[PDB]
C-alpha cells in the first residue's frame, strides 16, 4: 500500500493494533517501550496508556498510575 485505511505496523496495513501494541496518533501501532520513551523524554505531554491507545494525557476522571 502507498497508505493505510486503518493502522500501520511492521511494513503492513492492519485493521486494528493487536495487543500488545497501542494505537498512536490514530494511524500507527507502537509498543510499550515507545510510549514509555515519549513519557520519559518529557520528564510537552507525558504520554499515557488508555483504551489500547498511547495518548498525550489521561481523560477526565483519570490519573497516571505512575509505573505502568
Amino acid at each position, epitope marked *: 500500500c502507498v497508505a493505510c485505511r486503518n493502522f500501520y*505496523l*511492521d*511494513g*503492513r496495513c492492519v485493521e*486494528t493494533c*493487536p495487543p500488545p501494541y497501542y494505537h498512536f496518533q490514530d494511524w500507527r501501532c507502537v509498543n510499550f517501550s515507545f510510549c514509555q520513551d515519549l513519557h520519559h523524554k518529557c520528564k510537552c505531554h507525558q504520554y499515557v496508556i488508555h483504551n489500547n491507545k498511547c495518548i498525550p494525557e489521561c481523560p477526565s476522571g483519570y490519573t497516571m498510575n505512575s509505573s505502568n
Partner: antibody
C-alpha cells in the same frame, strides 16, 4: 504464492533436543508473524509460540521453559528449538502465518511428524 | 491464562441438517478499540492441515461457503452449519487470538447415512 514448509528430523531420542526450520515464501517475515502449533496423535491443536514481525516472541507458559523461536528474515525461515523431549512431545508440528491485527493464523504448513523414541 | 471450552465433544448428523456448536472462553475476547471479538473457527479435515473458516467471531474467510455462520460475543460463541454437506466431516476448533493464542478441545462432526 503464500507457502510455509517445516523441515524436521522426524525422530528424536528421548531427553534430546528437537530443531525445526519453517521456510516461507510469498510474504515477508518482517510484516507477518509465524506461530508453531503441535498436534499429538489423535489429539487437538496446542499452541506453542509465535514470533512477531519485530522478532519478539510469545510462548505457551507450559513449554516456555524449554522452547525457543527465532528467525532469519533474509532467508525467510523461522526456527523452533525444543529442549529434552519426552514421549508426550511426539506430535505433528506446524508453522502458520499470523497476519496479526487483520486475520488470525491463516496459512498453515503441511506439518512435520516428530516421534520421540529410542 | 485464557481457557477455551467446546461443546459438544462430538455430534452426528445426516447430510442437509443444521448443526450448531459452542465455544466458551474464560475471559472476554471483545476488544474495546474495535468492538470485535478476537475469536476464530478452524476446520480440520482428516489428514489435512487446519483451515480458517471464521475470524472476528463472525467474519467469514475468503472462499468459505455461506453455510458457515459464526455468532456470539464476549465469552460465548457459536458456529452454525445451515445445511451440512458430506464434505463437512471434520473437527472444528475455536481459537482466541486476543493475547497469545489458545485452541479449544474441538468438536468432531460425524455423518449419519
Amino acid at each position: 504464492q503464500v507457502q510455509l514448509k517445516e523441515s524436521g528430523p522426524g525422530l528424536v531420542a528421548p531427553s534430546q533436543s528437537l530443531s525445526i526450520t519453517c521456510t516461507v515464501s510469498g510474504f515477508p517475515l518482517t510484516a507477518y508473524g509465524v506461530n508453531w502449533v503441535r498436534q499429538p496423535p489423535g489429539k487437538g491443536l496446542e499452541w506453542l509460540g509465535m514470533i512477531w514481525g519485530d522478532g519478539n516472541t510469545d510462548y505457551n507458559s507450559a513449554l516456555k521453559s524449554r522452547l525457543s523461536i527465532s528467525k532469519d528474515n533474509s532467508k525467510s525461515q523461522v526456527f523452533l528449538k525444543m529442549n529434552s523431549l519426552q514421549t508426550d512431545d511426539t506430535a505433528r508440528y506446524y508453522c502458520a502465518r499470523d497476519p496479526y491485527g487483520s486475520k488470525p493464523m491463516d496459512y498453515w504448513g503441511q506439518g512435520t511428524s516428530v516421534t520421540v523414541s529410542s | 491464562d485464557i481457557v477455551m471450552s467446546q461443546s459438544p465433544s462430538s455430534l452426528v448428523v445426516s447430510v442437509g441438517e443444521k448443526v450448531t456448536m459452542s465455544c466458551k472462553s474464560s475471559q472476554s475476547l471483545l476488544y474495546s478499540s474495535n468492538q470485535k471479538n478476537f475469536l476464530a473457527w478452524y476446520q480440520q479435515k482428516p489428514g489435512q492441515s487446519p483451515k480458517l473458516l471464521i475470524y472476528w467471531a463472525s467474519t467469514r474467510e475468503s472462499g468459505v461457503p455461506d453455510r458457515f455462520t459464526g455468532s456470539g460475543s464476549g465469552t460465548d460463541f457459536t458456529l452454525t452449519i445451515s445445511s451440512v454437506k458430506a464434505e463437512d466431516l471434520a473437527v472444528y476448533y475455536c481459537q482466541q487470538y486476543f493475547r497469545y493464542r489458545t485452541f479449544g478441545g474441538g468438536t468432531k462432526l460425524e455423518i449419519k447415512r
